[PDB]
């Protein structure tokens, strides 16, 4: 790794600097280097890792959709297809990189619910981004890989976290979107979002003002989707 010679703490520091500078490719490379030091990640470090790659893959997804839309109109020279493929391959590469970090060896060393659910949710997310661009004979297996990861994360979160836990809430949000538009299960999506929202509502009374803010922010995203879906 090109980050093999840099101190773990320096990589984390520079990831935070890169975030401030909106240099998310750099941020992701720094956090990949930190992961490859082999130590477990703290909560803050997990969030740095996720924010970095979410920003990188988000740009790729938005670009892919623009090209995927222009390509569909053109259908209903080879250049549109070629360039959509180029972006698609880059996007798949980022997803494979993240999945590789989770498999070697973040998930297997994650024993606390807050770390293990976080990583399994990420695994679901990056298989979902692969599913968004998948068209071949592996699309069903990619979708089932996303489903499996989300389901394991859900099972742990329901046993080990309160219904307002923001990790649990964000997992349920993303799994519901998976259902709606990847699994073509809109009713499952709506059910999951509603049940998640209502069970969180009923647990808000236990929270401090700060935790209340964190939980209600994600609850509003569930509501946003339910409003579009119903």
């Amino acid at each position: 790794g090109a980050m093999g010679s840099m101190e773990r703490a320096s990589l984390i520091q520079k990831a935070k600097l890169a975030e401030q500078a909106e240099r998310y490719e750099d941020m992701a490379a720094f956090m990949k280097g930190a992961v490859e030091k082999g130590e477990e990640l703290s909560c803050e470090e997990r969030n740095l890792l996720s924010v970095a790659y979410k920003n990188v893959v988000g740009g790729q997804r938005a670009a892919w959709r623009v090209l995927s839309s222009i390509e569909q109109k053109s259908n209903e020279g080879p250049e549109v297809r070629e360039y959509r493929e180029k972006v698609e391959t880059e996007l798949q590469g980022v997803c494979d990189t993240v999945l590789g970090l989770l498999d070697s060896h973040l998930i297997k060393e994650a024993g606390d619910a807050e770390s293990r659910v976080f990583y399994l949710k990420m695994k679901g997310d990056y298989y979902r981004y692969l599913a968004e661009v998948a068209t071949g004979d592996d699309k069903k297996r990619i979708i089932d890989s996303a489903r499996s990861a989300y389901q394991e994360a859900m099972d742990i979160s329901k046993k080990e976290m309160p219904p307002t836990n923001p990790i649990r809430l964000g997992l349920a949000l993303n799994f519901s979107v998976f259902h709606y538009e990847i699994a073509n299960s809109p009713e499952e999506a709506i059910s999951l979002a509603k049940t998640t929202f209502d069970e969180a509502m009923a647990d808000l009374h236990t929270l401090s003002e700060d935790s209340y803010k964190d939980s209600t922010l994600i609850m509003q995203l569930l509501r946003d989707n339910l409003t579009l879906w119903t």
Binding site: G58, A62, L173, V177, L221
Partner: peptide
Amino acid sequence: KLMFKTEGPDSD
């Protein structure tokens, strides 16, 4: 495409 809300940075 209409994108639904998911967790974290709305980076796309």
